[model samples]
Target chain A: EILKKPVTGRSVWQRAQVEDASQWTYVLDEGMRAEILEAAERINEQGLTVWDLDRKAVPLERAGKLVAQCVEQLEHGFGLAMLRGVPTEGLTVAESQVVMGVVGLHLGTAVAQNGHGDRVVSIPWHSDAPDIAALLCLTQEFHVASAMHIYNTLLQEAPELLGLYYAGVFFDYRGEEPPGEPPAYRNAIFGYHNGQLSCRYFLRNFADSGTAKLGFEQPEVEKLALDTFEEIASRPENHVSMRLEPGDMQLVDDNVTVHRRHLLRLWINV
Target chain B: EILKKPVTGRSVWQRAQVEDASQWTYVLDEGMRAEILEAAERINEQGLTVWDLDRKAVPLERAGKLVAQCVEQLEHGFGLAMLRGVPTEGLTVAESQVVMGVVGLHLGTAVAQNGHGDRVVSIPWHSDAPDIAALLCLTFHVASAMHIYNTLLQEAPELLGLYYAGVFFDYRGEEPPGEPPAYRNAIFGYHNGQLSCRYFLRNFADSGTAKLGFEQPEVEKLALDTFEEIASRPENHVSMRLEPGDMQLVDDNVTVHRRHLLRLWINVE
Candidate 1:
């Protein structure tokens, strides 16, 4: 009954709203590509990890304008932009991360997208959940199918859910654990801040962390609403399914866009 | 030289900026679908032509909200919206036109899209040059591809002054090219101060400079460069593939979008 009325401008949109590919794809010209490569080379020389590289490190003279345009497009236009035509043929894994990290810096400050407080981490290969506002595709294996970026303005479709709140628990199992010691839980997965939606969802961590056992249990109605929203997002037509090439960088609004990845087979060489 | 600086926020955008399919698409829910079908039935019963069906003739009650949203999306969001899930399988061509016309009415008043003052006209079937806002697709045969000529004058409105300076075909077959002496020029197409393009490239390309009665070489060069940039850059333009039930509405002034040729086959029962 609550779903019938107009809610906040968030939630899963109708699949028809995002079926056309032309709305969010930006192909780089020759000049833009040159700028990206030059920046990547400079960053590679510094030997900076994802965390070490900041906006100052990436000096984008000509590319900065393009980055600014992408930022505007994400926030103002369609909330998504795919940057193609970067040359990533022979760069190493670390170097590629540098390139992506530098470009990410130009767009916005990097924040912890995963439980470990690491920004600009690898996808599928690292086993860490991603909450980064932008996705920079460096290297993808040919035979293995990549992930699909699912985006929806939470307020647009399901305004009713804004009244309720849900917390996701993040558990780290890396260091030594005493026998029978329970995992740590924190408020991480889903939240609303100033009318914008924030989400970091990973199925394994949510189920294993025992966060659900805490006082985070939702009512039946709330659960139904969340389930319906998820169902709408999970529909193939609702989200854009993209197989990233080497040089493709997709920037999505973290507050408005939700992403999911398919199972990826790890490359033998990596 | 004119292409370097940033112009007003109306001209060509990076393809990636407009590539998100969600921004331009609106799928009809079950309720909206029922409303559309019901309206189509009501209009079909009236047995009206395209001209006869206006806003009052095909009233949209439940679908009015959707129409408003689409209008906002076109003007503010992504400059276009593809309406899907309207069942047009059994409806005749006239019935489908009624559906599109009423939907167009809710968005805005329909002006003449082509040389003929046709608020609603069939594409490819009708040999009219379309120069209006919004395109409502009804029924199209398969294997037919449509080309879009999208231009933005915000960046180079000064260059696009050439388009405004030129003239379009006031009448079809009035003065065919290669007839030696070109036809008289009474019609010129320059839009408002919005720095946008309202042009038909096919007419310009077919008629050549002699028909337009212009001798300026720089204007021709600027026009050629603008056309080349639009044609070469796939990111600058959007190509829409319309299904039977889909109705596309676009803001024509901000973006100059054109459609490709469609091959229609005769249905022999």
Candidate 2:
């Protein structure tokens, strides 16, 4: 297990800034749309609200095999994927939510987005509490920052700072948590886990962690690390920015990637 | 099929205001506690998250047989059911939430609360969006809407019309970006031979800003002041305190409810 070294190649990414964008994309064809449409129609006809839906309810045997592959790409292959053409134009917002939920059940079990059992959510620039997160772009722009790309950049410019991230900072749960769980937890922003470099970065949460745990404020070193991380992640050459068309779902391994939601249709699957 | 009439029946409760109050309470004796614990354990051991489960997965069988009967009592019997002794002491908050969700699934498939996919929620002396709503006192006080309706009908007649006409209350911050920040709601609703009350005085004052282009009219303010006083009157409400294992279920259309506990609101629509 490579612990304290700069990760390269395998998951390190800068291509969204430089490479051909179409290389990592999936589009729903007419045949695939049939699978989705029928599934949604059947769900509605059966009076199946999203709460009563499960992936098996989606009878996607033929044109739907690509979902698993895309998830695989998100986790091990590339850490990112774009599945466009979700047939949202024909559906109402509620119908679209069902389609997304259909995709989500196949992808992961949903974590409640809020104190109530809300699975759909607005946005987060930092890593969410899911292994892989998808945005269906029901309506908004989407941005991505590669943790691997940022990791390589840190190795080049500020390897010393990498230690701060690997060491981790406390993260506030924004006052949402389970029983006997406090409003915060400690986590390293970057580390080598399961033979890969994992990342969970959010500048505000770091500062919040300090507030909850430290009694005063975040330390200057922590600030430096956060600022450095943000500056790099936000840089034009270091990340990818795109306006996702409605129905175009984007997936990212939250472990190896961080994203911002200009936002809608979040799938915080298990 | 008629809209405005005073409701009088077993549904009315002034005794919760005065007489012997144990008539409506359901004590979860040892056997029922065992049934509840077993159901919770099976749910937990299966490694199921609520998202992955349905009512059939709850497997309540014996103790849960009471759920249907309680629902029957809630809808037709007394418009209320207090199922005490849920065996909360051995459970964690997450476990307790599961128990509540299990109960809710039997009551009704959950609604998204406000935005999307939120089954459990918090306080609303204000009427809520459910055919039936429940409060599982993870430790909780409460009121009856029918009683409130009755008090207004008999004591203050002119104010009653104002309530029937309703007033505009703030959405607080629950509004989506472009929707009107305030909407009109009558405190009293009579439809399909059923009467309901939606009361949230805090919602009437838009906090600091005028969300609607207008303020709550001075006349409405004075009206609501009277409404609030009547609502707060000791004889007008039935006050009940909940220990941990208590769950209070009420018919949303006929009952306006509130509690003192830190809560998780459930919309059993």
Candidate 3:
């Protein structure tokens, strides 16, 4: 069933609670940092690149335990966590990506970010993806989009337009046609699978299409739906932003909250 | 004239729109820090305390200008701002009070945060007796009462007139001599060019209005219920989490709030 009313859970976080940066920040204690440095040293010494490591292969006890905590927070808490003080600076870019990869390995298995197996590119993904979008920001001014709040506002203000999200709208696959299908496919912006609410919204895909592969021009309500969706999202009140120092990894469980950032991003699955 | 319709513009901030803390945060740059520091030293050297300080007494050009922007933000934009990173920690509590006083001086003249002369008090929340309510939470939230009124205008427009017709309120023992402890005032007032509000049903109950005077009419009770129900919606408010040394100033006339806080009320000259 569609989530007719607003959601109530850890996912629906308040903006005021996050004004303090530490609310969602998972800072590294010194011992955890030391163990991560040790893991970094092991990887650097073992001649293994970022591409060649898993959680057990890199073998972290303290750091791995804490990474599990972040995964728990992601799955059960606010659906957002920023792991700060990862030892990424002194190392080279490739080595830093290795450290990030190790963190990712502990959090979840790395799933490709987009179609065609591109695991590490920086596209500002929208909220409500099935997989976790993890970014090892070497930067925010990082903002979070609360899908619950966004949907609640939509439900209260314009209940009619919401059906557009459920009844599939065409999203331009951006030239990556899946297995000989048309360049565009109708994917509903929202989904209700097994009593869980999920959304996959990319503003550009709906508007930037050479048009949805329909044999006709865009409908009037189509533009209205897109505009209203953007209007609700455009306001700063819907999402709150917190600062991100260079060596922080922002992991968002896109199932609940959507974080829009980073240098080395991976769509991971637990 | 009563404002029967929903008010619009800056005051009706949607909670989703202003989540970026910077929207209402006035951060201190290094130069602003240096400017405020210079002012603090001048006050100290002159043997002046927090009471003796005024905007001119502590001459701050850069810091003064930014503070004025916060005041403008309050008056026009969002009706709220949190001054972040004031030089308060190294200073003693007395000295920090002086810093808050000086900042308040730039904002407006100090008024009793309540009926008592107590300039500062830890508290409950509301649209109290002040043009601007300065809180050093050193904070839960301030919601736009204007938005509340707007919702009232739309959802239950009939309740609007009861608020405008004026309700009898107990002066809570602060009434002038020979005056009735009970007084009558409109919850929503629109006289000059400005619109203002005063509300808190608890204050009415605490006042002698119920005991010595008339009990609040049933119609007004329904109005208050409708108003509170609309304001209570989570979407209607923006909560602020202020750490030590953070000061929040907001328009008391148009806003309603609840927070664990040290509050000060100010009346602008």
Candidate 4:
């Protein structure tokens, strides 16, 4: 008969209790959520205009500040950002249509009115956001054949975003009149469409260059915009859409709404 | 002054002494010389009729014994040998004239007789005696054009001589046979004429197919008829003209000779 020594020392259950006390869990709060929404909105409303303003301004501290704010909020939380409301500056008629087509991707419906338009933005990949987040356009107009040219060009300049989920919501502000087809609307969806989010936020008549757009400079106006979004999202079930008046404060949930310019005008300060 | 010790241990040379001894050497004697001379004389006097004599009757034994004797003789001395009084058997008219050319080589003179002699001997290439040895031929014959032809045919078999030398002489004969018209005589000179010595031993017989007037058994009678003159080299010098009954023996050193016949009534044997 074989004889073995009896088992000794602490059991597996005893050792597990010692490790359990040292671990901690991360939890999301309302304040953090409010901060993310505010930053996303700022990014959606100003991203393209600021890009245009920076290109013209030569040294753009104002637009740079907004982009930095958005990047900071993204880095701190969801690791994502929404950049919307890019303007179709210097674009031809055909190219303007293509820019609109790119904007249509957020609607996840038939975004093309014609065949020749570069409707590339209508095709997206995937996203972490439960809704469409952003869009882009070239303030430096490209031809219709080159409507999605900026995306290709940006792929070279900032290739990291080529596979990331985001729409480039450009507007046909090249004409004196607004686009004949209104920008597509979001019908309360809450998931990604291709790379675009279900909702998009855009703004027009923000300062053309880096000069402080009035709404950005006014502390009360910035706070009111944040407060409005916080109050709206707090509701059991609510949906809202509003225009950004020239020089008016604006905030949005880039995941909940599709917004666009009403008209084209030069130097209409936010 | 510093104190030091001599380091004298065994080097490679000392080690070799503990290993093996040097090769042995060979020597030749008077008995060996007599044996070779007697054999050559018997063949000349009797032709192939006596070639049937057993191994004990010949100067050289069988092939293996010949190789061993050559090697032993070669060990201490230069490799070379000589045979005197070799007789040409009955040869065809053409072959008879060709035999004369060999005498011309020995006598250092040319016989003007000419005919389209078709019969020639075939001596294989390797039979030249060993490098250092050569079986120099010395023959005796009658002075007729037929004698030249028969003798020439006899010596034509010398290629067998060359092969034996190369296989066993262990030394080179003359570097190359000399070129014509003096080529044959010149080769004799280069091998240093009949004075050339070698350890090699060889034997050859006139074949029954030789196309001449005499039978193999009758060759001895014809050979003995001029035996005395044929035995003596001075009797027919290269410069002398042949008398009708004069048979010639040549050292094959200074002249070449040949034989010619009008009718073919005999075979070489």
Candidate 5:
């Protein structure tokens, strides 16, 4: 039988949905917040300064000591001793307040005065735990200051680059319900750090958002958040970008660095 | 239930005769005898001496060296070496001989003369053999030497442990008219090492009498003669108990070390 064939239906291609990234929010309790603010007030009172090129002046070396003490106090009080702090006889409230002030000043100077320059920092490989969030938050504060320094100091010529924001840590829902596509977010970011200045920010948070994008179920969200934090903090090999806000600060191994933004939409606080 | 017990007639317990054990002898041929004598001459010229002591002495050291060299040479030449000679060596002939003589002198002096000692000798685990018979021969020599050394050096103070003889390798035979019992004798044996060293002399003729209660046989006559010749030299592991007129020394390591004695009696000349 001879016959001529005729084609009918057309081939079709399916499109997939773009995924949105998940985020974690870290909040300090009222007591911890009070302690932090008091420390900042003390530092501001002393007019303590850090490596500021325009000011091109070294604050009283005692200022640096004070800054180191503030960081050390928070490191212990918040059980962040492992970050960097020596245990003395006992930690008093005054000592804690002093440590907080020192940390704020040091961070402010590190960000505003010294341009993000070439400096090798060492960060040991460590996994994140719930308790580590406090240490990470403090570290982020420092990163915020550092970022400000780069924007204000080095990137003056290329202000556009300074406009580039950096942040670290993301809650990835890779394995979750509906198995929808994952959210896009950087785990760590670095703006610029050459002869010019650069900005750096680090974030630390923990949460368990259920049925979230990026495939997070109720249980895994918490795990993912904590795990990501620890992984970034411990690994010196990975360099991540960061973003900072007015009050937020970061404490991290300057060497083991990474930053990322969690929320896609910018929040405007009036 | 009752059952009657079966009874059987009593019979004599006949023991299997190990005629082969008796028939075996230690003898070497003329050529072998000459070879051993030459070895001994070299050893003697080197002033070889036996080592039997704890502390290192000159004579024993020299003799031990010489003996090892002789064994080495014989193993190289004939592919087998036998133990014989009055245990001696010197510094000039060979380094091994010199060491043996020195060590031997020290050992002998220490034990026989000084009476204070500890034996320091290396014993090989496996009997070195290029063939079965050679292996057997080496085993025999080692066994005898070890036995004597143990007696004189190890258990001498115990009167009950004063046994002078040693075990030997008895060979099996398979041929027609295999005369009653012991057919061939190729094994090691031990007697007082010094006085009746007949290993070389026994080779001159074959005798049927067995001194060590060994059955003599005609089939292994040549082997007996050969061992006799090997035993002729006076240099052997000496002891005081060996009686004269006894065809004692049968074979040494460089010569036969072991032999196939005739099942017939071997009358000592």
Candidate 6:
């Protein structure tokens, strides 16, 4: 019986859970936007990245509260937050990063977002395993919209794949030939940190990571599991696609959600 | 700079995640409730437990459709559903289970709910780990609401595998807290690929059932971490304030749920 079959290990969810972008999107009001723009102008005058701004130095009385709420929602609620209406009309990409950086400090401490150890970073289509990931758009050209998957929903639909995930599978990230030494091995495509699921997936990264060095044979079930995951993830209903406006910041709980983007030209400071 | 520190390894969520109950609730229509109650009365006349009822044996053409939809919502939507208005005015506890069983068949096949292999069971202030747990509030007086640990798979689908590991449940309630018990056996497990988490924190913490092959420290740590994350984030979970006639179906895999203390009066049918 289909019911008797072992449930695929996945975070179960459906399109109905988040089809309304308003559930995850938060637009800054005119006043709040002005406050943030003022902070950005001050930081721009000093010619600094987010790393130089202190929390007290860039205090946002009203907007800071909203930032804190966004952090709470990203961490404990839906695991995703989109802050729109930050005026990026004339700000440089670096200036936008600084503004977002100041906002990030109030949310949580910043960590190296990528292998490059850059405090600010950008991505194509990949999952970053961090407590929180803040990506602010500095430029917006016609780009394939970025999408996210709530792992809980995937697991509910395909529980059989749980065994493969637990078996220490590696997601290859060498497809785009990122400008850095590809790590020789990535032991965990899915990891548990502080009792929550965290993911590190780059399709090419998994393909190129080569299972032989990891000392595990790629079993038929694992391959099938990968195929099933890709198929489900490809479904439009399972993902939320959104266009990033300049100065719009996307904060995600990297542990609970996986994000991917289509071809796009943008200056993003992660 | 706060930005310079390495991020803490914790699932970030709090009470702010699930402050709204209506977002996760579904109320049954009076007509649907009446239909289910009729099914219950018919099944009671035959005198069969839920285990004895087969899909073809018990049919719910109209109510079954609703069950299917509820199942879809539980599996694919919000991970929770509540069917209110099931009139249990004259039904016995056993009769109610049979009615629920008929509905369960329509939703999905019923498997053993616990290691005891019981098809249906009951608890007071405890947790049951099954793919789907159908709980009907047979009695409701001075009862605390049932709390669910909402892992918003709707928002974070990538984190599904993190719950593969198992944790223990204690049922002993409200004894002075003390040192962690040395358990030899685990109450919860993922054996042969099936996840079992029949836990009651208070019971497990106070009981001496430690001979059940306790999980490794890392597993225990993961379980505690999960517990803490859920406890800290009340907003992510939906609390069901059940009326006497309410039946709630929960996705156990998506949400780790718990009930508060209940004042029970035994019924001899």
TM-score against native, each model? 0.37, 0.47, 0.47, 0.14, 0.17, 0.42
lDDT of 6 by residue, A1-270 (tens): 012122222233345566576877777788887888788777777776666556787888888888877777765566677777766667665665666666676776666644665676644344454566666776662111122243443356565345335444544443333534332333444555454455555454454355443233454444555665656666676666677877677776555555666111112222
Residue-by-residue lDDT tens digits, candidate 4, B143-182: 1112222232243221111211111111122224431110
Regions of candidate 1 where Cα sits further than 4 Å from its true position: A1-270, B1-5, B10-12, B47-50, B53-57, B112-119, B124-164, B167-170, B173-193, B204-222, B258-269
- Leading candidate by lDDT: 3
**lDDT (C-alpha) at residue B83 in model 4:** 24
Query: lDDT by residue for model 2 over A127-204, one digit each (tens)?
Result: 766788777776545677788888778776655445456556657666655645545555667767567677877557
Residue-level lDDT tens digits of model 4 in A1-270? 000112121110121222231121112233432333343344345543222222222222333344344333322222223333333445454443333332222222222212443223321111212222223333321000110222223233332222111312122232322343222211111223354323222231221111131101212222232233334333322212233322211221233222222222111111
Q: Write the per-residue lDDT of candidate 5 for residues B25-84, one digit (tens) a residue.
A: 223344433443354455567665433222332222333554344334332222222333
Measured against the true chain A, the candidates' chain A TM-scores are 0.65, 0.86, 0.86, 0.21, 0.24, 0.72
As a whole number from 0 to 100, the lDDT of residue B184 in candidate 1 is 23
Q: Which docking category, incorrect, acceptable, medium or high, applies to candidate 2? A: incorrect
Predicted candidate 1 versus true structure: per-residue lDDT over A66-176, tens digit per residue: 777777765555555677765566777666656666667677666654456655456611112322355556656211101112212333444323322232323443332
Ranking by lDDT: 3, 2, 6, 1, 5, 4
**Candidate 2 vs 5: which has more lDDT:** 2
TM-score of 5: 0.17
lDDT of 6 at B12: 24
Fnat, model by model in order, equals 0.00, 0.00, 0.00, 0.00, 0.00, 0.02
Which should have the higher lDDT, number 4 or number 6?
6
Give the alpha carbon lDDT tens digit for every residue of B1-269 in model 6.
00111111111223343345464455667777777777766777767665656667777777777777777766655555676665665667666666666666666767764455566666523344345667677671111111222241332222223333223333233224542222222333334533333344534542432422222233234444444454445354445478776777665433445551111111111
**DockQ: which candidate is best?**
6
What C-alpha lDDT do the candidate models reach, one value each? Answer: 0.48, 0.65, 0.68, 0.25, 0.26, 0.51
Tell me model 3's lDDT, rounded to 2 decimals.
Answer: 0.68
Between candidates 5 and 6, the lDDT winner: 6
Error of 3 at A75 (Å): 68
Q: Over the stretch B1-269, how does candidate 1's per-residue lDDT look in tens digits?
A: 11212334423355565666576687778887788778766666777553445566666677887777776765555555667765666767656665666566566555554455555556611112222244444452100001112233333332332333333233444445544233322111322423333344444444543443323243334554555455445555556577766766555444444451111111011
Candidate 5 local lDDT, A114-163, one digit each (tens): 13341111121222211112222222212111222222222232221111
- Model 5: residues with Cα > 4 Å off, grouped in runs: A1-27, A47-135, A138-270, B1-94, B97-269
Order of candidates by TM-score, top first?
3, 2, 6, 1, 5, 4
